[PDB]
């Protein structure tokens, strides 16, 4: 790997520089190099890994949606034929997005998840696994769509089971997991009622636990709670 000769601490330092410079592809390459050193990641380092790849795949998802929309319009009645180029280029972006998702899933499988024993690491990684299968599901159309969806569901479900047993209902990881599993239900799994029920129960159980929190923890939790509320407003 191109980062094999760089010190772990230098990779982490440069990932933070890349974040400041909004160089998310570099950030992701640095964090991949850090993961491949073989040591477990700290909380901050897990956040860096996620920030880096979320921004990379975010740009790809946004581009994919633009191109897919153009492609679908080209397939309407009365649309002039323009050749294979829209499909080809959508496929190019799609393949690169799938590559990034596969890279993240590979890091999680070799060997972040199997070494993660604490709830805060294990839930974070299983949520990521669900997320990157969800991003794969957004573009899936063939014989493996169902299996990709079930892989996302399975990872989210294992994360949910641990988070409910081991974390308070205000924990931001637990909240962000529930938020994302609810998005999965609504947007991927054709289960809007499950999405709404999960968002509401998650919000209400967190509300009831806010009284236990410091001012700073209250701010962290309410930020994610507001996203649940925003989704419920969109969906109801």
């Amino acid at each position: 790997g191109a980062m094999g000769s760089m010190e772990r601490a230098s990779l982490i330092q440069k990932a933070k520089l890349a974040e400041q410079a909004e160089r998310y592809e570099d950030m992701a390459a640095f964090m991949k190099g850090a993961v491949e050193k073989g040591e477990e990641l700290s909380c901050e380092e897990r956040n860096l890994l996620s920030v880096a790849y979320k921004n990379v795949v975010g740009g790809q998802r946004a581009a994919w949606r633009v191109l897919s929309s153009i492609e679908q319009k080209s397939n309407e009645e009365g649309s002039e034929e323009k050749g294979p180029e829209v499909r080809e280029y959508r496929e190019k972006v799609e393949t690169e997005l799938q590559g990034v998702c596969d890279t993240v899933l590979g890091l999680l499988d070799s060997h972040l998840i199997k070494e993660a024993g604490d709830a805060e690491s294990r839930v974070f990684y299983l949520k990521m696994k669900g997320d990157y299968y969800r991003y794969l599901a957004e573009v899936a159309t063939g014989d493996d769509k169902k299996r990709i969806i079930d892989s996302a569901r399975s990872a989210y479900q294992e994360a949910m089971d641990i988070s409910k047993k081991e974390m308070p209902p205000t924990n931001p990881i637990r909240l962000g997991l529930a938020l994302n599993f609810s998005v999965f239900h609504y947007e991927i799994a054709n289960s809007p009622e499950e999405a709404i029920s999960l968002a509401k129960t998650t919000f209400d159980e967190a509300m009831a636990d806010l009284h236990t929190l410091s001012e700073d923890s209250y701010k962290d939790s309410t930020l994610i709670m507001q996203l649940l509320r925003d989704n419920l407003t969109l969906w109801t």
């Binding site: 897990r46 956040n47 920030v51 974390m167 994302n180 996203l227 989704n231 969109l234 969906w235």
Partner: peptide, 9 residues
């Protein structure tokens, strides 16, 4: 819909 921020607990 909104999904979680990357950086989280």
């Amino acid at each position: 819909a909104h999904s979680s921020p990357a950086s989280x607990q």
